[PDB]
Design a protein around this ligand. Structure first.
Ligand SMILES: COc1ccc(NC(=O)[C@H]2CN(S(C)(=O)=O)C[C@@H]2C(=O)Nc2ccc(-n3ccccc3=O)cc2F)cc1F
Ligand SMILES: [Ca+2]
Ligand code: NA
Lengths: 234, 44
């Protein structure tokens, strides 16, 4: 996360971290249920073998509530391709159920029609993760969160070197130095409706990080709600 | 549903709720069934 603030205790409980063989976090994920993590398809390429850590807020310190889970099944969207970064979604079934506790709790999945009309029309969403704090810099050792405005699809298309598809939406800032960054990829974009946080996006990609005239691009979860339901039923 | 979300706490008049929640008596609010319901920040 570029800009933003460290998450307060219990504020980002749906955050998951994918960790590689070197025990290093390389991508985020969203807790959907005791057995399922939502992440980005492109994250699956970055590490031949990985695990999921939940409950972590500081990667340099072992604190209560941290737990590591083996992934039993990877369900990657069959239409994902690095050519377009379209269909950038995956679901991970964990070997052993997550025990919900402080800092460990699922984000809600919305109903398609309602989310499109009611959630996505909200002013802002929240993104979080452990990724780079500057475009070329180091990953954060602390879990960070950032409020990101939804950005008009057409404004975003005009700003982008690459095709923005119906499976993507844009969020963040034109010039303000705040954005998700590499390492946050795969992580949650959630939208508050009243007092409940619903998963609306998967941190996907951007041209640089917090670049002037560029936005953050997210996988539009509403387009994949049936796919997620199907994937979660095996 | 157009205005005020039909006064529903979650999904919209016919209100409804996400998994781990039950629609309240009033037919609008949503009641969490467990201690760690989806979409709620956690408290000690
Ligand atoms: C909103 O979340 C994020 C915001 C920004 C970022 N930013 C980033 O990750 C950039 C930072 N780093 S860097 C310079 O520090 O080494 C390189 C990353 C990048 O260049 N990503 C990138 C760019 C373009 C496509 N793309 C799109 C369409 C078609 C083909 C296609 O390749 C795919 C990509 F991976 C990440 C988020 F996860
Ligand atoms: Ca820790
Ligand atoms: Na920008």
């Amino acid at each position: 996360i570029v800009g933003g603030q460290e998450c307060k205790d219990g504020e980002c409980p749906w955050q998951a971290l994918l960790i590689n063989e070197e025990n290093e976090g390389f991508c985020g994920g969203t807790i959907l249920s005791e057995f399922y993590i939502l992440t980005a398809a492109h994250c699956l390429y970055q590490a031949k073998r990985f695990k999921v850590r939940v409950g972590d807020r500081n990667t340099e310190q072992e604190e209560g509530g941290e737990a590591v889970h083996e992934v039993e099944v990877v369900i990657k969207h069959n239409r994902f391709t690095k050519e377009t970064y379209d269909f950038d979604i995956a679901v991970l079934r964990l070997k052993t159920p997550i025990t919900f506790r402080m800092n460990v709790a699922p984000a809600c999945l919305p109903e398609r029609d309602w989310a499109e009309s009611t959630l996505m029309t909200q002013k802002t969403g929240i993104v979080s993760g452990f990724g780079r704090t500057h475009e070329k810099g180091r990953q954060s050792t602390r879990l960070k969160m950032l409020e990101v405005p939804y950005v008009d699809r057409n404004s975003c298309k005009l700003s982008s070197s690459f095709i923005i598809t119906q499976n993507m939406f844009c969020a963040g800032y034109d010039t303000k130095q705040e954005d998700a960054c590499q390492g946050d990829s795969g992580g949650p974009h959630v939208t508050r409706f009243k007092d409940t946080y619903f998963v609306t996006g998967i941190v996907s990609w951007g041209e640089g990080c917090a670049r002037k005239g560029k936005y953050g691009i997210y996988t539009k979860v509403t387009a994949f709600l049936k796919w997620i339901d199907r994937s979660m039923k095996t | 549903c157009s205005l005020d979300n039909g006064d529903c706490d979650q999904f919209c008049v016919v209100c409804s709720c996400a998994r781990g929640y039950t629609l309240a008596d009033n037919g609008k609010a949503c009641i969490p069934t467990g201690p760690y319901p989806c979409g709620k920040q956690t408290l000690e």
